[PDB]
mmCIF file of N, CA and C in Angstrom:
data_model
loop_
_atom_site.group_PDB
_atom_site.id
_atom_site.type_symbol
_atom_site.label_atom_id
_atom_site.label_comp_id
_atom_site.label_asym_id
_atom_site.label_seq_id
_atom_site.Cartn_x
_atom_site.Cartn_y
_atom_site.Cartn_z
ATOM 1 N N UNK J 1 8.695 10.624 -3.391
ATOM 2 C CA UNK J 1 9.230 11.874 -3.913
ATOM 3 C C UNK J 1 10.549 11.628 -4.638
ATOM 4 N N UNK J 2 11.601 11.140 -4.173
ATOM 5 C CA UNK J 2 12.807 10.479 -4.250
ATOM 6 C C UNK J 2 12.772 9.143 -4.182
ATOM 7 N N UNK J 3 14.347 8.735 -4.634
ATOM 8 C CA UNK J 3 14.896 7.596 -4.333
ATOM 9 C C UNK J 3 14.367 6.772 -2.597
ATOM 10 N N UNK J 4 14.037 7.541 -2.069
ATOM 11 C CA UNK J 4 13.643 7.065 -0.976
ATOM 12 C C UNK J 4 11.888 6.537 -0.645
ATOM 13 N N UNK J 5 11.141 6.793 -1.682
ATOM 14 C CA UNK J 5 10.022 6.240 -1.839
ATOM 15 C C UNK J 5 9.662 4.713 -1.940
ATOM 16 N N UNK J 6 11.033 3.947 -2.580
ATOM 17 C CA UNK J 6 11.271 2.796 -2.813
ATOM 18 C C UNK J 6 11.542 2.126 -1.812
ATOM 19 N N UNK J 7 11.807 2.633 -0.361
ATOM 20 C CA UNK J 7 11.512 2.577 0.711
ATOM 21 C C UNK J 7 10.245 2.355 1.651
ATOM 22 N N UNK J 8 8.941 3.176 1.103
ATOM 23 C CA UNK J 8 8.256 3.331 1.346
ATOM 24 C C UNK J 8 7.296 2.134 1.183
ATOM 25 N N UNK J 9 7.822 1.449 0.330
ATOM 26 C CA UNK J 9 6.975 0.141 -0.225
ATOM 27 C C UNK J 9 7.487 -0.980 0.641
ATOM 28 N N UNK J 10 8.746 -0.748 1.276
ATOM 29 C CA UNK J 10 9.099 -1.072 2.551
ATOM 30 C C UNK J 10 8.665 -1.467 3.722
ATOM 31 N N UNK J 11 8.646 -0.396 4.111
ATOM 32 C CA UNK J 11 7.233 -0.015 4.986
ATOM 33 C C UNK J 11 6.545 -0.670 5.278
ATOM 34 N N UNK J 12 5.335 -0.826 4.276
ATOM 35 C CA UNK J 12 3.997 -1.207 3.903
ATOM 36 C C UNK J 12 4.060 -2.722 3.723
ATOM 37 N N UNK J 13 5.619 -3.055 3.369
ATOM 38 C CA UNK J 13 5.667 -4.389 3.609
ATOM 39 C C UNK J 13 6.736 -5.111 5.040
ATOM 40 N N UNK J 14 7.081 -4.434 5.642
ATOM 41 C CA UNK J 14 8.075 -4.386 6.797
ATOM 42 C C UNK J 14 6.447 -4.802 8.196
ATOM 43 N N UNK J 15 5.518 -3.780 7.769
ATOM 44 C CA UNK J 15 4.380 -3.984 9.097
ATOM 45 C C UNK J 15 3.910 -5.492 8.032
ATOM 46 N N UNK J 16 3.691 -5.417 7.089
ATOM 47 C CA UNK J 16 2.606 -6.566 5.984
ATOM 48 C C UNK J 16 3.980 -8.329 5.940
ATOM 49 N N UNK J 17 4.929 -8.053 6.277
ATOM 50 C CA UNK J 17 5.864 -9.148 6.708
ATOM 51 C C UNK J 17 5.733 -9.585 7.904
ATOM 52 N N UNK J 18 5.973 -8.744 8.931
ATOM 53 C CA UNK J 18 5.700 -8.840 10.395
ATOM 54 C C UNK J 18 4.981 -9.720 10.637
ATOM 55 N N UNK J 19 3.389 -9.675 10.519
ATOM 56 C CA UNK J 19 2.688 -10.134 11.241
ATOM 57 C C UNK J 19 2.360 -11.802 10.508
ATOM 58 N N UNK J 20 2.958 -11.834 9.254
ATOM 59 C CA UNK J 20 2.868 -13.307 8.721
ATOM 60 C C UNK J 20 3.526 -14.228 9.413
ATOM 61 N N UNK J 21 4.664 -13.836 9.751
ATOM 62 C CA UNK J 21 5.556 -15.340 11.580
ATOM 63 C C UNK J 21 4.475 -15.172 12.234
ATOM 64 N N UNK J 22 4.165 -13.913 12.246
ATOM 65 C CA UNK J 22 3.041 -13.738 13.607
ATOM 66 C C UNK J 22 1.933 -14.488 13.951
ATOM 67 N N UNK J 23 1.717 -14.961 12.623
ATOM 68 C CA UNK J 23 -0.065 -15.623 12.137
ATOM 69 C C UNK J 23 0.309 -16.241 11.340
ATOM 70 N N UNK J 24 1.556 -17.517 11.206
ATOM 71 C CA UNK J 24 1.893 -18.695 11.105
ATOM 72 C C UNK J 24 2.493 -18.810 9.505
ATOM 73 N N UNK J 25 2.291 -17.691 9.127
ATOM 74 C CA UNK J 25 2.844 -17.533 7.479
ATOM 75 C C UNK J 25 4.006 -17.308 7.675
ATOM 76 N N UNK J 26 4.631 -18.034 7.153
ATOM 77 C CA UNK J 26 5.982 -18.247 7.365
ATOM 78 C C UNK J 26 7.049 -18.130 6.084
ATOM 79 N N UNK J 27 6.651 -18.700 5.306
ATOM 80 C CA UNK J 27 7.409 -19.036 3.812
ATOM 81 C C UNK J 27 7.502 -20.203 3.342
ATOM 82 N N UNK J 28 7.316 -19.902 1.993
ATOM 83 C CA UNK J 28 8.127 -21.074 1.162
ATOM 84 C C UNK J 28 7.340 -21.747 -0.372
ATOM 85 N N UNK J 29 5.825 -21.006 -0.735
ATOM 86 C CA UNK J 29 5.425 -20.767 -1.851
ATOM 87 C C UNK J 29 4.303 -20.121 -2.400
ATOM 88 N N UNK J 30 3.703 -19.602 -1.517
ATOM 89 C CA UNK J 30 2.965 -18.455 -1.860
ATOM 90 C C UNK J 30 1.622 -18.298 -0.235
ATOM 91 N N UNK J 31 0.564 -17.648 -0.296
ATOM 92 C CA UNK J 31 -0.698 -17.606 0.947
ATOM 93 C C UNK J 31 -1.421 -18.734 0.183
ATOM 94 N N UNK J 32 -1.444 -19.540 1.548
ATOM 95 C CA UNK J 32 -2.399 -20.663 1.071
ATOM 96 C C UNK J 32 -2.818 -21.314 2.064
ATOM 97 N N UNK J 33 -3.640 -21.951 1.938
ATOM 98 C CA UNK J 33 -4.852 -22.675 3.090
ATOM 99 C C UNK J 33 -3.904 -24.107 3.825
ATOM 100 N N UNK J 34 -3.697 -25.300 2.527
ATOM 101 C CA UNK J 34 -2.679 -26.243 2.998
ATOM 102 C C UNK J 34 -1.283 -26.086 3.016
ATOM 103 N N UNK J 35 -0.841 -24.757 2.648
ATOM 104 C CA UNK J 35 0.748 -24.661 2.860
ATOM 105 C C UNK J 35 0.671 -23.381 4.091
ATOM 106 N N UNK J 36 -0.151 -22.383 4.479
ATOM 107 C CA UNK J 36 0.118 -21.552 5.183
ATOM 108 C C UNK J 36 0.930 -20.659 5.427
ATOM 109 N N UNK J 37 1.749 -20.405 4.169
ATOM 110 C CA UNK J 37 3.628 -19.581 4.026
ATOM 111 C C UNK J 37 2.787 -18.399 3.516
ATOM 112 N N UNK J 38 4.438 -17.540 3.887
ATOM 113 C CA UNK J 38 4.194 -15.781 3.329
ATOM 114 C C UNK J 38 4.976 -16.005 1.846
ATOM 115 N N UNK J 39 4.243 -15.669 0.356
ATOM 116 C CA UNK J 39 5.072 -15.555 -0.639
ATOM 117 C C UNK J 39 6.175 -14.684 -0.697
ATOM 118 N N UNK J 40 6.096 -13.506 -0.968
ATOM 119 C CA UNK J 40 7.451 -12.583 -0.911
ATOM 120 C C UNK J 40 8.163 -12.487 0.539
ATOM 121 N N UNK J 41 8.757 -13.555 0.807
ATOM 122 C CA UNK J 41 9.428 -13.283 1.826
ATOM 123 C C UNK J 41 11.324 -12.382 1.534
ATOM 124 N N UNK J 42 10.993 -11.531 1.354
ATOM 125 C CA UNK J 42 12.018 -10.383 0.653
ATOM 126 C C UNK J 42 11.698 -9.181 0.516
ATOM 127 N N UNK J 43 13.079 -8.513 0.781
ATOM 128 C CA UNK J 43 12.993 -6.531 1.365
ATOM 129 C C UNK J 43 12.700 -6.402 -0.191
ATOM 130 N N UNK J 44 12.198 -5.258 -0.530
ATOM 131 C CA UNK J 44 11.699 -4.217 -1.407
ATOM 132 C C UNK J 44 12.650 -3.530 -1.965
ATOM 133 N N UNK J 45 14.363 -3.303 -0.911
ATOM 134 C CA UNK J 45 15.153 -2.659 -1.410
ATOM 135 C C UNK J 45 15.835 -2.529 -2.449
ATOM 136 N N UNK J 46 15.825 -4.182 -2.642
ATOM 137 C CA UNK J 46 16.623 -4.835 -3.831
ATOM 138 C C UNK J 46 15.500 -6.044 -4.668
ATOM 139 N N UNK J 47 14.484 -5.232 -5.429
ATOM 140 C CA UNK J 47 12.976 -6.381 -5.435
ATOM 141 C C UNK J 47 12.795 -6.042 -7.057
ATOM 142 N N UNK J 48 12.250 -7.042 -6.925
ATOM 143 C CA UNK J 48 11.737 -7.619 -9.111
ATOM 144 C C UNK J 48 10.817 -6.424 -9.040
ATOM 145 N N UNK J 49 9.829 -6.867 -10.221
ATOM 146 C CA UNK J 49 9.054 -5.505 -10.622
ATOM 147 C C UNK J 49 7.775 -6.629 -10.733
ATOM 148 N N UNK J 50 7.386 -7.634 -9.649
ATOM 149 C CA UNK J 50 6.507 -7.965 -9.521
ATOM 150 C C UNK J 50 5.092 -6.960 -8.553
ATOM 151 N N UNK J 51 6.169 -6.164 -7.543
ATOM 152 C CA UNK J 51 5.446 -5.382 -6.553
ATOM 153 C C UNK J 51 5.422 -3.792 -7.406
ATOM 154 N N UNK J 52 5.783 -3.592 -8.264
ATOM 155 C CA UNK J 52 5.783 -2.192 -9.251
ATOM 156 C C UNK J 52 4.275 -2.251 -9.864
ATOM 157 N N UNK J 53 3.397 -3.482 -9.977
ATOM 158 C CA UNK J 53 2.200 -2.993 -10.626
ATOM 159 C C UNK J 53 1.226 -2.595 -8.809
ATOM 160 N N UNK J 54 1.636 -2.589 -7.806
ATOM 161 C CA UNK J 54 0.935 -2.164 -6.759
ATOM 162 C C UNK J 54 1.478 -0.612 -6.284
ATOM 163 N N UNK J 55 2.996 -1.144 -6.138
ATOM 164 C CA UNK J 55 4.119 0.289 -5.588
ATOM 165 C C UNK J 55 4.222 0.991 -6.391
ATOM 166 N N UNK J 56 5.104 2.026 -5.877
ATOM 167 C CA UNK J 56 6.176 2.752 -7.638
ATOM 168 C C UNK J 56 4.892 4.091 -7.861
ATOM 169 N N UNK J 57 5.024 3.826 -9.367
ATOM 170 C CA UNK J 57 3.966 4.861 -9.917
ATOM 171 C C UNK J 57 2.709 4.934 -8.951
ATOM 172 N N UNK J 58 1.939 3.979 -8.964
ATOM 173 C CA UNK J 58 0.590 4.175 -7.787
ATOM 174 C C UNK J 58 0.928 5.024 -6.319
ATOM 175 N N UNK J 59 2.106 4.358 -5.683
ATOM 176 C CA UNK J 59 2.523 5.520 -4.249
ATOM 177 C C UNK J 59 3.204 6.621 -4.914
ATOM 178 N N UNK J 60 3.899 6.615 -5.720
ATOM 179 C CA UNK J 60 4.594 7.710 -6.528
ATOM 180 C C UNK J 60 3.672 8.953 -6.513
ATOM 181 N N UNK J 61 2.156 8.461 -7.108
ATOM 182 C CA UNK J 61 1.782 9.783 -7.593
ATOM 183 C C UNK J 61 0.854 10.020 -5.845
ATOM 184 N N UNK J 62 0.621 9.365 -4.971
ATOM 185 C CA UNK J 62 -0.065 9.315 -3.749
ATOM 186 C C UNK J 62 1.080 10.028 -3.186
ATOM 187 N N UNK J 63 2.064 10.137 -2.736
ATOM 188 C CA UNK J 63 3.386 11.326 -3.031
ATOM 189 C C UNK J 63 3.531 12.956 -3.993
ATOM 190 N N UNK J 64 3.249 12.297 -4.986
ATOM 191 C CA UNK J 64 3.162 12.966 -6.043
ATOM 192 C C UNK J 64 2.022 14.140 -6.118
ATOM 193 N N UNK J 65 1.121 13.622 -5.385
ATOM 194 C CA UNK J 65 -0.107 14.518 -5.903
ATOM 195 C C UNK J 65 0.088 15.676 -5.252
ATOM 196 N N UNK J 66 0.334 15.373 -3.576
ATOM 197 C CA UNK J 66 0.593 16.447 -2.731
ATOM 198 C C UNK J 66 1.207 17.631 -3.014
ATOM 199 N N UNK J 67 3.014 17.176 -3.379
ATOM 200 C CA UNK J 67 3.399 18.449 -3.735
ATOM 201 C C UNK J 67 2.646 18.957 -5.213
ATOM 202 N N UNK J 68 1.597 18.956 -6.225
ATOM 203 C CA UNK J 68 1.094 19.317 -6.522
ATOM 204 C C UNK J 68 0.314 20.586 -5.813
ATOM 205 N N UNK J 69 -0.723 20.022 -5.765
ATOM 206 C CA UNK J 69 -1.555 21.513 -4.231
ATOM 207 C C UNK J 69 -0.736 21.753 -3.349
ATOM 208 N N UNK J 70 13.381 -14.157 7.575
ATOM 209 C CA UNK J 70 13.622 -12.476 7.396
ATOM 210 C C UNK J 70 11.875 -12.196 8.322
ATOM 211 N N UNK J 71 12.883 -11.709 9.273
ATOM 212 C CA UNK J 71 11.828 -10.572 10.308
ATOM 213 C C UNK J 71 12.316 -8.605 10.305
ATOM 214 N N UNK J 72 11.389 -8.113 9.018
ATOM 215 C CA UNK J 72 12.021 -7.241 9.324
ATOM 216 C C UNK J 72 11.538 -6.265 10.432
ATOM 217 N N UNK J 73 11.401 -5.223 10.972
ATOM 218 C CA UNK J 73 11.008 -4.666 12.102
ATOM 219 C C UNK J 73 10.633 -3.306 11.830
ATOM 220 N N UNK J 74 8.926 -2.819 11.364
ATOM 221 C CA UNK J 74 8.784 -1.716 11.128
ATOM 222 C C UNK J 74 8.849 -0.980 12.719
ATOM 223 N N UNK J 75 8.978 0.298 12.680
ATOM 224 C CA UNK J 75 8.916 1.350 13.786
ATOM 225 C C UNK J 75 8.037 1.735 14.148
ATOM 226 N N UNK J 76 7.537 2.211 15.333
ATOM 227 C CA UNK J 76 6.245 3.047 15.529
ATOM 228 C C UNK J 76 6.161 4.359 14.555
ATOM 229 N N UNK J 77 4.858 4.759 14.239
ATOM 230 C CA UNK J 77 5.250 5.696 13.467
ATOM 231 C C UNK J 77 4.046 7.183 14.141
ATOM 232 N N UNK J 78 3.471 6.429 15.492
ATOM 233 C CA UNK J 78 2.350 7.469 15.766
ATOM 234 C C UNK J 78 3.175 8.250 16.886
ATOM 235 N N UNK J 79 4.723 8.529 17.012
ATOM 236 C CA UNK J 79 4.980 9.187 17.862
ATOM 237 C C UNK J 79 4.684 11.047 18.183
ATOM 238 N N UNK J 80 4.630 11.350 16.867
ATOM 239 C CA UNK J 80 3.733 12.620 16.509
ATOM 240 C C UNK J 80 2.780 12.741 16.156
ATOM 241 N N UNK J 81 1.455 12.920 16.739
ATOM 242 C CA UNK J 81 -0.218 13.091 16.416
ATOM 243 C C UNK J 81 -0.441 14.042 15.623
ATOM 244 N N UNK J 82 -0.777 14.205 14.690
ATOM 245 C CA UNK J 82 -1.157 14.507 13.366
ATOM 246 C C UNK J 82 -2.431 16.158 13.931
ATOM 247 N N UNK J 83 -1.724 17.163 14.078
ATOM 248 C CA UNK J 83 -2.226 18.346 14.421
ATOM 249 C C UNK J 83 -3.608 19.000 13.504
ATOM 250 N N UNK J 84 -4.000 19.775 13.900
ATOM 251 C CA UNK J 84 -5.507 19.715 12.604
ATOM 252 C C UNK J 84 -4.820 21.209 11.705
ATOM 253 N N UNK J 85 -3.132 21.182 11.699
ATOM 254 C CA UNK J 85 -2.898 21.316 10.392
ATOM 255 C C UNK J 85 -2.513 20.063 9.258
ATOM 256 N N UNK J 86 -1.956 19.294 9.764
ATOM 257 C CA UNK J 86 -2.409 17.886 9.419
ATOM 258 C C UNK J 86 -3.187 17.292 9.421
ATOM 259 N N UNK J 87 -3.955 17.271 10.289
ATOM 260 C CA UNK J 87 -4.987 15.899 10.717
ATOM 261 C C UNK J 87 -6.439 16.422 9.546
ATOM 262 N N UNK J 88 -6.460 17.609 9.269
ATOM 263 C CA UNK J 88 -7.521 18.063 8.015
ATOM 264 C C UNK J 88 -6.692 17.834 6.678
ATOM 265 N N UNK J 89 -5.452 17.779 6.587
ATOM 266 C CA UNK J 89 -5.071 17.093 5.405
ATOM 267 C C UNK J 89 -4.769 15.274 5.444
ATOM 268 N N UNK J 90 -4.813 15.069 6.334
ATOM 269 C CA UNK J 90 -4.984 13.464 6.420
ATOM 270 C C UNK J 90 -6.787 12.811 5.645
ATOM 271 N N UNK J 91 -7.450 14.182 6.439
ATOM 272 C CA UNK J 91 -8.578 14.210 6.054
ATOM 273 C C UNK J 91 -8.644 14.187 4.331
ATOM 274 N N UNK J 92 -7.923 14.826 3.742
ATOM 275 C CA UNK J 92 -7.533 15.046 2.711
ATOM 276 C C UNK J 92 -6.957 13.597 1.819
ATOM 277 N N UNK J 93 -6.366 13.157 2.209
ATOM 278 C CA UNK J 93 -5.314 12.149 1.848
ATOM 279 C C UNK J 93 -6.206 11.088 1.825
ATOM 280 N N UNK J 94 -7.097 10.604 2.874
ATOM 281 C CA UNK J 94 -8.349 9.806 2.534
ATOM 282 C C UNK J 94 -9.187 10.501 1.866
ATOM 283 N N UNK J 95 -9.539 11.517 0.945
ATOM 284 C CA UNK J 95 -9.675 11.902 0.107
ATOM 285 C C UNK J 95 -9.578 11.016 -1.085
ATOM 286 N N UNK J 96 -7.988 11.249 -0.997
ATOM 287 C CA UNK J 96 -7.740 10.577 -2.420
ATOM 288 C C UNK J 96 -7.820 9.220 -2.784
ATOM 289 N N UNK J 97 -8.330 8.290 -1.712
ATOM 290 C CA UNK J 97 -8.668 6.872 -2.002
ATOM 291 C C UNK J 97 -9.669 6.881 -2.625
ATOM 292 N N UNK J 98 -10.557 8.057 -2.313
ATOM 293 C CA UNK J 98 -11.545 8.052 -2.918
ATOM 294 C C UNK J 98 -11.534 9.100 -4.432
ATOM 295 N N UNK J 99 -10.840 9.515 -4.576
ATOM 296 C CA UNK J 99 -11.032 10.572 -6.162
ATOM 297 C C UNK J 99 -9.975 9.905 -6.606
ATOM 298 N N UNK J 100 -8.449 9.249 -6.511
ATOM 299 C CA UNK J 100 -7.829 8.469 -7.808
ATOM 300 C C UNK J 100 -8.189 7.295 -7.759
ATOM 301 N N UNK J 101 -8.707 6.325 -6.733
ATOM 302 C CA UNK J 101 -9.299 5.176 -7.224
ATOM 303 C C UNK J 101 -10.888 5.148 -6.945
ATOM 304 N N UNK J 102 -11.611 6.229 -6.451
ATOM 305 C CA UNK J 102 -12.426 6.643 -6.678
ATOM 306 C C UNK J 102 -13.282 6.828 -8.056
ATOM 307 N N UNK J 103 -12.220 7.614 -8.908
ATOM 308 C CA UNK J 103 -12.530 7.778 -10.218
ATOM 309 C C UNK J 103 -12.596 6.845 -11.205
ATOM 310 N N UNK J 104 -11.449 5.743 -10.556
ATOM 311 C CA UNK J 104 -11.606 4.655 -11.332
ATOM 312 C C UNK J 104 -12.648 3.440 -10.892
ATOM 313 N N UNK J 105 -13.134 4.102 -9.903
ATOM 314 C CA UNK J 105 -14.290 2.784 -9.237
ATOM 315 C C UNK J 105 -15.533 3.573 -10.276
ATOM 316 N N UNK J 106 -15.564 4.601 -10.721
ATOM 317 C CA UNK J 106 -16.903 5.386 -11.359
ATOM 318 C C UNK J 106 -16.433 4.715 -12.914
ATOM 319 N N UNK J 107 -15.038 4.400 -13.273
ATOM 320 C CA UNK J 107 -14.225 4.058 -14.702
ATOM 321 C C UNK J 107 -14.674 2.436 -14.432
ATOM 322 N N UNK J 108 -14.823 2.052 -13.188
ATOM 323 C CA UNK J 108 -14.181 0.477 -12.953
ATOM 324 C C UNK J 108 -15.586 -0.235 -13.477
ATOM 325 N N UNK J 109 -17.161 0.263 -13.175
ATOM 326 C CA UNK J 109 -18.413 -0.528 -13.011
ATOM 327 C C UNK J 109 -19.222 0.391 -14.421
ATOM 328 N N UNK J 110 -18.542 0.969 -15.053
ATOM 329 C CA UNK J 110 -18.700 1.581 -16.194
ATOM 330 C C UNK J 110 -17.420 1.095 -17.470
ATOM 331 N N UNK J 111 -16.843 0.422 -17.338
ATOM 332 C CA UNK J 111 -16.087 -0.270 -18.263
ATOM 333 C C UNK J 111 -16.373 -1.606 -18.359
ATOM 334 N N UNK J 112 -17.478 -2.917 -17.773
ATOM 335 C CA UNK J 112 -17.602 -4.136 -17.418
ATOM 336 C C UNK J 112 -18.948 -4.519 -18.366
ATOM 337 N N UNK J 113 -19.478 -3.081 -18.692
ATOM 338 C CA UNK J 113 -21.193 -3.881 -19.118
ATOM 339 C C UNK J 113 -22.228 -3.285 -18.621
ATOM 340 N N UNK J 114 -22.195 -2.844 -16.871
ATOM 341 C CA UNK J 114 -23.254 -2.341 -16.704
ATOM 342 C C UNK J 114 -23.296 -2.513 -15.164
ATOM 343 N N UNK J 115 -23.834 -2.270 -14.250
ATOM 344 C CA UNK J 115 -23.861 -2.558 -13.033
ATOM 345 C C UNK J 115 -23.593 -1.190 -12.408
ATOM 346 N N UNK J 116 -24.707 -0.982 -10.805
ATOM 347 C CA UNK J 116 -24.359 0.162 -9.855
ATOM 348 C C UNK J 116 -23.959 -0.095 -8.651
ATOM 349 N N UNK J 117 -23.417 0.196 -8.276
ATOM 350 C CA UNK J 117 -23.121 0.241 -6.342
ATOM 351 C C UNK J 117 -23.241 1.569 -5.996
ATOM 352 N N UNK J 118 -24.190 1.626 -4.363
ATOM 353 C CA UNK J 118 -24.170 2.439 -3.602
ATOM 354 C C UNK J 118 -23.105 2.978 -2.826
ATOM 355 N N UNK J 119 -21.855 2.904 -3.538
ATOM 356 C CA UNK J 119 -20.480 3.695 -2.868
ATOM 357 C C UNK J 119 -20.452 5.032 -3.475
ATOM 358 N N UNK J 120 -21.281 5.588 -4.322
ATOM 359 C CA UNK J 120 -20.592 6.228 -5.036
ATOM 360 C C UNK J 120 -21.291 7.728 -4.792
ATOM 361 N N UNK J 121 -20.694 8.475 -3.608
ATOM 362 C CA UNK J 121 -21.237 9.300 -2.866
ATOM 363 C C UNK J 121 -19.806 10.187 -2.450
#
């Protein structure tokens, strides 16, 4: 929504950092079979615009749409259970995995040549 979204990519990499010490990825030049390191071993706070073609605009508008209608240590975040005035818009929110990249999975096997998959339900 804000300046604080840039945070959010945080997050997503604070739990996605974690568990690489955890499961022997450690650092020092990228995921790999004979080296076994975590590549971005670095906060998001202060980060290149290598993680902007995943973050940014893509969570931006996953943010965005709504109001329409180094060990770092993420937090628990299930301390409030998601009520079924929430929990039917969560319902919602997996929704949209499926209608903005949804739409582009109907854009994605229709821009290549030709080809169907049975996802598309």
């Amino acid at each position: 929504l804000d300046s604080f979204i840039n945070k959010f990519a945080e997050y997503t990499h604070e739990k996605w950092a974690f568990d690489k010490i955890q499961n022997n990825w450690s650092y020092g030049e990228n995921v790999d079979e004979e080296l076994k390191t975590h590549p971005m071993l670095r906060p998001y706070k202060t980060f290149s615009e290598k993680d902007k073609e995943i973050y940014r605009w893509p969570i931006k508008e996953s943010l965005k749409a709504m109001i329409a209608w180094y060990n770092p240590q993420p937090p628990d975040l299930s301390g409030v259970t998601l009520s079924r005035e929430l929990q039917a818009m969560a319902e919602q929110l997996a929704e949209n995995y499926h209608n903005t990249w949804g739409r582009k999975k109907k854009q994605e096997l229709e821009a290549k040549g030709g080809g169907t998959h049975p996802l598309l339900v």
